[PDB]
Amino acid sequence: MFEARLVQGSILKKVLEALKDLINEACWDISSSGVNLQSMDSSHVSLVQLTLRSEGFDTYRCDRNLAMGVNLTSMSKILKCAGNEDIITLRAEDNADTLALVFEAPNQEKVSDYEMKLMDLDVEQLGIPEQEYSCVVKMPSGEFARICRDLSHIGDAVVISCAKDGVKFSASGELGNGNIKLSQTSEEEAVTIEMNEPVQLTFALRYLNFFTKATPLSSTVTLSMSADVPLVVEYKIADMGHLKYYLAPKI
């Protein structure tokens, strides 16, 4: 039997909002340690990895390992029925074919219970060796979102260049070209850039704009890059875990 009670339900609402636009279905691997979710989008251009530790929940119970196949589009729609101040509980039986979501309003006079069917999903393995990157940039999450949004008005792809001094994001299109340069500042609104060697990569803005849907989950975002390797964009979910996105570069 599975029981996960999250007092700050808005966290789950934000997670689904950050997932649904990128992937429509995924397997939520549940265990005594928490919730793990990993899935590539249909085009295999990006991969999302979610971690929600048991310690982050008010109450957490998962007698046995479970792999629940879930329609994220449907789950997000149901989470729309939860207030931002609702306590949210996810509940499932041992051999669950359904997932129950319970929302407790802050007024204590209203309690909602939603049940959605689970689905069989061919959860695919995806060996990704955690390594070190040539360049790691940490910046305000809102700042990164605004950069991706702005350049999207200019082009469909962004060239990210790293070197001594800062990081530059460049795009070009029919209306002209633009470059946004970020230089290290002197935790939330600061910019830190650790460079091992200059790196230049091109990425599709369409996917980056999907990643920034996770902005409300954290005040900061960290970008990790290395030549000819997937970009990694990470958002820490305050004392819960994190949401990591991987994106294959162009070429």
Partner: peptide, 13 residues
């Protein structure tokens, strides 16, 4: 051209 993560990672899922 846009690459896919399969060209960078081993899957077999």
């Amino acid at each position: 051209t846009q690459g896919r993560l399969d060209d960078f990672f081993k899957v077999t899922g």
